[PDB]
Amino acid sequence: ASPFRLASAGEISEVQGILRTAGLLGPEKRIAYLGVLDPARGAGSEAEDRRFRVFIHDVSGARPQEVTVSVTNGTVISAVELDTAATGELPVLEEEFEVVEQLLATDERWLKALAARNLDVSKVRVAPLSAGVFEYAEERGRRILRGLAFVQDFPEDSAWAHPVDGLVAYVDVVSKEVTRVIDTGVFPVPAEHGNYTDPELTGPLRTTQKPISITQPEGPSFTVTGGNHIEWEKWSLDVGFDVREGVVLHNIAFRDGDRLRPIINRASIAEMVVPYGDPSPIRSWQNYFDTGEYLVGQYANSLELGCDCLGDITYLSPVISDAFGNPREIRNGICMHEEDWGILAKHSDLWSGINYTRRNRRMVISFFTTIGNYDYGFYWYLYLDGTIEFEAKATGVVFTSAFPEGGSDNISQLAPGLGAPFHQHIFSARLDMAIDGFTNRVEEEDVVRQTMGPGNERGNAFSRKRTVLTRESEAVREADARTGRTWIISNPESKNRLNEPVGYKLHAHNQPTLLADPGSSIARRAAFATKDLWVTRYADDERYPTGDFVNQHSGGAGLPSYIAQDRDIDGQDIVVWHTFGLTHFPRVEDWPIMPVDTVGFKLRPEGFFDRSPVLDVPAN
Ligand SMILES: [Cu+2]
């Protein structure tokens, strides 16, 4: 009954029939993106209208379309042709991935390059990578992938241990032709294997680990109704799933006594960029927008009980569309469970004789995606005390290269002759705020040091200041860890019992933002990654910080273009965009498979409640 329910297999079949009956989904058509649209802004929005947005690719070379359909009417609402040279190519299709290796295997330049290295072509895997926008005019308007080669000594061999440096090819995957093959010289192919299930590398497994059993003999404390609506320890929200963004959180709210108080209207990771910092021509074009170009949702893993998710697990199995409009189920794609989180609050009072201890808990919503060599886990946490946290967990196999004789300033060595180029993993969280409702404002809070003098005679005082961001043109902010900079999102029209505006404080990790030169191609396509915090006035069509079509787009779209409208944000329907990321200088311990590293952010209440909201937690 809820308009935020997950898309069903039946709705996706219906979309397929509608597009077919309308003549839009012929044999040469492919769905490159399909997802449900959010309900438009309407406090009394009654008539449900499940609409879906579709990107339709044409394998014949015809122009692609963006289409919106109403499954709640059986009709097509809109259909537009796209000029991809102007506004960007569609996201990469899964079936295009393998074409790169097969096209290259019959190309004379490629085989000549392999023969000079004594490589057997049937043993050479090609990683199909997004192309970006650089100095090649012939690529404009065409759908291009680039390919780097790795040797697989046998079918179960880890190819990442054997990169073929000095070689790269570009491929047009619509016309199926190899545009270029570049060979800058031969490097030895690193010989050691990186097979982390081979007993000769692992040695005998440990026998010292005894089991940890986590059970809930009365089942979990949260309830799921309507497929995806969660209630847990005064929290209320809907778990959505989009093939591009992955897990999305809707209608995050908290039951403060009698009333349900909104906090966040929609929360998602709206983009993710991985820029590489190796200046070699073989790799200096390498940047993937895993969300915008590949769609992290469609590579979600099925999560195995006891290995990926431990405890009393409730699963969601979201449904997406394949390239032809048939429903595909991701079995066990989302884990939800609650977990113990240590002491919540504690005090032993000498004067009163009362000893008081309460334990904390968090609700966990997670999924895991695999893109080529990388694996990323996405974790949302909700705590008893009203804190919201996001955590990214990065693992997988590092992207490799040769390690040059004589060292490198932009690559680290993992093994004899084997290198790993420096790179970043940078995320953009889109937080459509609704602190006690939709009239919100953002203030920047800095610590203020005070000078010893009159009024401060002992030189101990210190303070803080808050600056209201009133217009979009002044709402592009950077971190300042040294002055304890945070940002407060408040509602100036909703006051707590002390007559203060209610609010939430955003705590950033203050990791470095995009390191590339501001004149570079990647600084233009990933402009959002150059600043820690952006605030925009809400609009229906401003969904992604890089725009709708990231693949091979020239740059500037998204946030810098939104901000230029200079709209009023002082007490309005606003959206916060937080950039945060990992700067990865790979280490020996990352090889042959890398332990998890983490980055994230959190929001804590700042005078939102009238007192601690966990006074009613029992002792247990
Ligand atoms: Cu990394």
Side-chain angles (χ1 to χ4, degrees), residues 1-373 375-620:
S2 154
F4 297 97
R5 66 192 183 272
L6 295 163
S8 54
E11 287 180 297
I12 294 194
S13 292
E14 203 48 31
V15 173
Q16 184 188 56
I18 289 164
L19 293 176
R20 268 179 186 171
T21 285
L24 294 170
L25 195 69
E28 71 276 40
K29 305 312 195 183
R30 308 285 188 274
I31 313 271
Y33 167 87
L34 181 145
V36 74
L37 287 168
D38 291 334
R41 286 297 205 257
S45 278
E46 197 60 86
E48 143 182 304
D49 185 16
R50 297 283 283 197
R51 300 169 169 220
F52 281 79
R53 190 189 192 196
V54 193
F55 299 165
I56 305 182
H57 175 64
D58 188 284
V59 304
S60 300
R63 298 225 289 201
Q65 300 196 283
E66 168 184 349
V67 181
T68 298
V69 317
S70 159
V71 152
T72 323
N73 271 358
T75 77
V76 167
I77 281 167
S78 186
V80 190
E81 273 191 11
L82 309 159
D83 181 21
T84 72
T87 44
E89 304 289 341
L90 268 46
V92 184
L93 285 181
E94 191 169 24
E95 87 199 44
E96 287 156 357
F97 273 152
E98 52 216 68
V99 163
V100 174
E101 187 176 307
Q102 280 124 51
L103 274 183
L104 285 173
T106 65
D107 184 274
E108 200 193 340
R109 302 163 282 192
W110 190 248
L111 297 153
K112 180 183 195 213
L114 297 186
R117 299 148 164 88
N118 307 309
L119 298 179
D120 181 2
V121 67
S122 74
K123 271 159 175 221
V124 169
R125 307 279 85 73
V126 181
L129 309 166
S130 62
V133 178
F134 293 95
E135 40 263 53
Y136 310 115
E138 78 267 23
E139 282 167 7
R140 277 273 200 126
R142 265 145 34 116
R143 163 176 287 266
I144 296 289
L145 292 174
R146 308 188 198 293
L148 295 164
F150 299 80
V151 181
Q152 226 190 342
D153 285 344
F154 53 94
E156 322 77 55
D157 193 42
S158 176
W160 316 102
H162 313 301
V164 184
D165 220 323
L167 179 68
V168 64
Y170 314 156
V171 172
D172 181 321
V173 304
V174 176
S175 80
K176 316 199 226 243
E177 104 185 332
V178 174
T179 65
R180 272 174 225 226
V181 176
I182 291 158
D183 190 335
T184 66
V186 312
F187 299 75
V189 175
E192 278 191 23
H193 71 76
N195 293 325
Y196 35 83
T197 54
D198 180 343
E200 150 207 334
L201 192 50
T202 67
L205 274 22
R206 305 159 191 222
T207 56
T208 47
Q209 292 198 4
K210 315 283 194 47
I212 298 171
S213 168
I214 300 156
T215 63
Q216 295 194 267
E218 303 179 35
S221 325
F222 61 89
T223 75
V224 183
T225 64
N228 71 337
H229 176 89
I230 309 305
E231 310 250 322
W232 175 82
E233 293 302 296
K234 320 267 193 80
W235 289 98
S236 176
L237 68 151
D238 310 297
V239 181
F241 192 83
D242 182 78
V243 71
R244 175 165 181 172
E245 287 175 289
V247 161
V248 178
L249 303 189
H250 303 274
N251 307 311
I252 298 178
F254 191 107
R255 199 159 327 248
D256 184 13
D258 256 32
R259 50 194 227 282
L260 191 51
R261 305 176 57 192
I263 291 165
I264 295 177
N265 181 66
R266 197 190 187 265
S268 71
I269 303 303
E271 190 55 83
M272 198 209 307
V273 68
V274 182
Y276 275 80
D278 182 356
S280 154
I282 302 305
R283 276 170 309 270
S284 58
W285 49 269
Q286 213 179 330
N287 318 262
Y288 331 123
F289 298 77
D290 287 314
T291 304
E293 293 168 332
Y294 297 114
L295 321 183
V296 301
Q298 79 180 341
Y299 297 106
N301 305 355
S302 281
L303 304 171
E304 299 302 334
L305 192 54
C307 315
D308 299 296
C309 310
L310 189 62
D312 197 306
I313 314 295
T314 297
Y315 285 98
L316 297 184
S317 285
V319 187
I320 60 172
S321 164
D322 75 357
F324 304 95
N326 305 113
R328 176 151 96 73
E329 213 200 34
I330 292 145
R331 180 184 118 81
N332 296 350
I334 301 159
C335 280
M336 326 183 296
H337 65 279
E338 59 173 344
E339 69 188 27
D340 176 73
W341 201 244
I343 303 302
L344 170 69
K346 197 180 157 64
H347 178 56
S348 310
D349 200 67
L350 192 58
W351 290 332
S352 79
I354 296 163
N355 293 344
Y356 180 101
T357 306
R358 298 298 186 262
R359 286 202 74 90
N360 203 356
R361 266 168 203 234
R362 67 182 186 181
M363 170 99 192
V364 182
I365 299 158
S366 72
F367 82 105
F368 232 103
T369 195
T370 307
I371 317 282
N373 61 297
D375 306 71
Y376 301 113
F378 294 72
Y379 290 79
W380 298 87
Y381 307 124
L382 308 168
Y383 297 84
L384 292 183
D385 74 327
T387 300
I388 304 151
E389 179 176 0
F390 174 85
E391 178 160 57
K393 297 189 187 188
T395 179
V397 178
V398 289
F399 202 93
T400 49
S401 70
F403 188 71
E405 245 189 313
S408 174
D409 290 322
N410 313 95
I411 305 162
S412 38
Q413 193 177 13
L414 306 169
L418 179 74
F422 299 173
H423 59 282
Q424 302 184 279
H425 308 266
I426 301 180
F427 306 80
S428 177
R430 180 178 175 286
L431 308 181
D432 175 7
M433 297 306 298
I435 300 293
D436 247 1
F438 278 114
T439 62
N440 291 170
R441 54 146 56 130
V442 181
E443 318 172 79
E444 183 168 282
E445 182 180 276
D446 287 342
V447 172
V448 162
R449 323 255 320 249
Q450 294 181 238
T451 58
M452 177 166 201
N456 185 24
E457 282 81 14
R458 289 188 170 127
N460 65 304
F462 65 88
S463 191
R464 57 170 167 191
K465 76 177 169 188
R466 295 189 178 170
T467 301
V468 193
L469 312 176
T470 67
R471 286 254 142 183
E472 274 175 324
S473 57
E474 72 188 35
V476 187
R477 316 310 287 188
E478 41 188 44
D480 188 345
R482 197 172 314 287
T483 64
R485 173 164 305 161
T486 61
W487 300 271
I488 293 135
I489 307 99
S490 54
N491 189 327
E493 286 181 9
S494 178
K495 293 170 176 258
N496 60 36
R497 79 173 185 112
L498 301 179
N499 212 245
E500 281 283 292
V502 299
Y504 258 76
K505 193 178 267 182
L506 172 54
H507 289 88
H509 288 193
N510 303 319
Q511 298 295 309
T513 49
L514 187 70
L515 299 175
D517 183 290
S520 66
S521 164
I522 190 55
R524 282 186 309 250
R525 296 177 64 230
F528 76 93
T530 61
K531 303 285 179 196
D532 302 85
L533 194 98
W534 313 62
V535 186
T536 59
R537 183 66 175 280
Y538 167 84
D540 284 343
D541 57 333
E542 299 181 2
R543 285 170 174 111
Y544 313 112
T546 41
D548 289 337
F549 306 98
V550 186
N551 191 11
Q552 294 180 255
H553 186 278
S554 199
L559 278 183
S561 155
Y562 309 158
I563 280 311
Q565 294 166 101
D566 204 16
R567 293 165 292 193
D568 171 48
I569 52 174
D570 181 1
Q572 300 296 344
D573 198 348
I574 64 172
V575 181
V576 175
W577 316 67
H578 177 43
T579 296
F580 60 100
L582 286 162
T583 294
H584 190 180
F585 298 109
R587 61 200 176 124
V588 183
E589 291 90 349
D590 293 330
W591 186 250
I593 183 160
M594 85 171 95
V596 152
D597 205 358
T598 63
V599 67
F601 67 89
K602 68 165 102 141
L603 296 113
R604 299 178 95 216
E606 175 64 36
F608 188 85
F609 299 102
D610 287 327
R611 51 188 65 80
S612 163
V614 290
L615 290 176
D616 59 356
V617 170
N620 287 352

